[PDB]
């Protein structure tokens with residue numbers, strides 16, 4: 418990509434205030450609830466039979482924390498995202514066979530979650546930078562297919 | 564990408580038999596007919612008011628020939644596609660503002676057209692190689708956005 | 710399909726939107742224009758500066774149409790017929806863009822409701838906005 | 851929507867398909883498995899070698915269902931209700947894959963009709979397959 422000082426600042430400044438556990442659990446729960454076919458990949462996670470069950474699922478929440486921690490690795494090294502996710506790209510593509518379209522859906526969910534958590538700071542400009550971020554992460558993970 | 568000898572052969576051997584003018588006109592006409600919103604980008608092309616009008620539109624046919632000739636530049640240099648289309652990427656993204664999803668739709672149309680023209684040679688294996696090709700071209704053109 | 714629960718969650722959030730149709734609409738549009746600049750090419754006749762008169766008035770119109778959609782949720786196709794012909798035949802709007810505006814509208818809702826934009830409310834609006842989008846693009850199929 | 855012309859073009863092509871349901875179905879499935887290998891993970895219980903008994907029998911079932919869809923084209927949701935529950939609730943099929951199989955089916959049609967798979971026939975089948983796909987995934991919305 419091509420990061421401007423302003424974009425990097427919108428990303429790092431907001432991330433420093435992010436409750437990774439809360440935001441991560443929210444993002445994954447919403448993925449499973451809003452796009453139910455994604456539950457196919459989490460059979461070992463136990464009860465996912467309802468939105469309430471998903472929101473109270475310890476494994477879903479813990480996994481969401483690990484996923485957002487991963488996004489954090491993109492935030493911490495904005496110019497080397499493709500490289501940082503090469504490993505995870507192989508996992509999701511070669512091992513799990515997750516269609517790349519879902520990487521974009523999760524990214525969209527994260528944008529909405531960030532908006533619910535930072536109403537004043539998540540301006541259109543901030544959204545633009547963060548959308549560029551989630552898209553870069555999705556692109557990096559999809560490389561294991563292209 | 565990562566081209567195997569077998570894939571390169573499926574591509575070069577079939578392309579050598581391709582009537583670029585016919586296949587190109589067919590691909591573009593089908594894009595405009597099957598996905599009508601794409602007509603937005605061809606206002607200067609005259610009458611596109613019906614499938615028959617589109618199929619008899621000289622400019623649509625001529626433009627399709629130029630587009631398939633472009634695909635030919637990918638076929639002729641399979642290991643340097645990203646580079647070959649960098650220029651066109653700027654045109655479609657920065658100048659024309661064509662959403663990248665349409666690059667994939669055109670690629671899909673080309674696959675179907677090739678199947679109608681080469682029933683015996685377009686085996687599932689041949690299709691796999693050609694799909695890898697149109698996707699690589701679409702990916703290269705979309706880089707002007709990422 | 711949209712359940713009775715979905716409809717109630719939608720209506721509860723919607724009565725807040727109707728109080729500031731211009732503000733909400735303009736914010737959704739501006740986020741789309743800034744985050745997805747390609748969409749700006751559909752509005753060359755508009756002054757696209759922040760809070761321009763054209764953006765605010767159009768924002769209100771968009772919200773008004775969504776409001777009508779909320780009312781006749783069981784009769785979407787018929788209710789938005791004029792608008793579906795407009796977006797498909799006149800404007801030739803790429804279907805992908807309906808998803809972009811829908812997403813931006815959800816961001817506006819999230820920012821304004823905060824804690825209250827729960828996963829259940831998100832599902833309800835995702836279903837609703839997706840249904841509206843399908844209708845606005847049905848003249849392509 | 852599907853016009854009377856679309857339906858006639860569809861039926862003309864379809865009576866040929868019904869003569870070799872197994873062959874057509876198996877070819878569409880095999881192209882999907884080879885071109886989009888990720889889809890193979892939905893069939894771990896199947897021997898996926900070329901022309902396997904499981905691929906041919908399932909191919910016939912898929913074509914049979916599409917055939918029923920052709921018959922009750924005005925009542926799709928109701929006609930495919932059992933199958934929509936199956937693909938959404940039991941199989942959890944990713945919506946993207948319906949588009950992949952639809953595309954592969956079109957390739958099979960193109961290969962078998964050659965010159966006769968005109969842009970008009972393609973439009974008709976694209977509309978038809980898209981409608982069927984929307985129904986098979988409607989339990990997600």
Ligand code: HEM
Nearest residue numbers: 455458459483484487488505513515519520523554555558
């Ligand atoms: C594009 C954003 C995504 C990122 C950054 C991401 C990151 C990760 C990471 C870091 C792990 C390893 C967890 C660990 O260390 O235990 C993981 C696992 C996994 N991911 Fe993702 N992921 C993403 C999207 C998705 C999507 C869209 C799906 C499918 C709906 C998915 C399905 C899975 C599955 C099934 C696992 C295995 C975990 C287990 O079995 O416990 N991921 N992901």
Ligand code: HEM
Nearest residue numbers: 601604605629630633634651659661665666669700701704
């Ligand atoms: C991804 C496959 C595509 C390739 C390889 C491609 C290639 C090209 C090339 C080489 C030109 C320049 C023609 C010349 O030399 O005069 C061109 C022009 C153009 N393309 Fe594409 N294109 C693709 C897809 C698309 C799509 C999907 C659209 C939108 C639906 C589009 C819209 C246009 C437009 C509007 C022009 C300008 C031509 C004019 O004004 O006469 N292209 N393309």
Ligand code: HEM
Nearest residue numbers: 748751752767770771774775792800802806807810811845
């Ligand atoms: C939530 C989905 C959408 C709804 C409900 C909607 C609704 C409307 C309505 C009601 C109008 C007419 C306003 C009037 O009569 O003054 C309109 C106009 C228009 N829309 Fe949309 N729209 C939607 C999405 C889009 C998208 C995605 C685009 C493209 C990015 C778009 C581009 C336009 C344009 C260019 C006009 C002309 C307005 C003018 O010239 O003032 N719309 N829309």
Ligand code: HEM
Nearest residue numbers: 889892893908911912915916933941943947948951952986
């Ligand atoms: C053209 C759209 C589709 C139609 C009409 C369709 C139709 C059907 C039908 C009728 C069955 C039941 C066969 C029986 O009763 O023996 C079935 C089963 C199944 N389908 Fe689909 N299907 C479609 C798309 C897909 C897609 C896209 C996938 C995923 C890649 C998929 C995966 C499956 C699986 C795993 C089964 C279980 C079959 C078995 O165990 O034998 N289907 N489908």
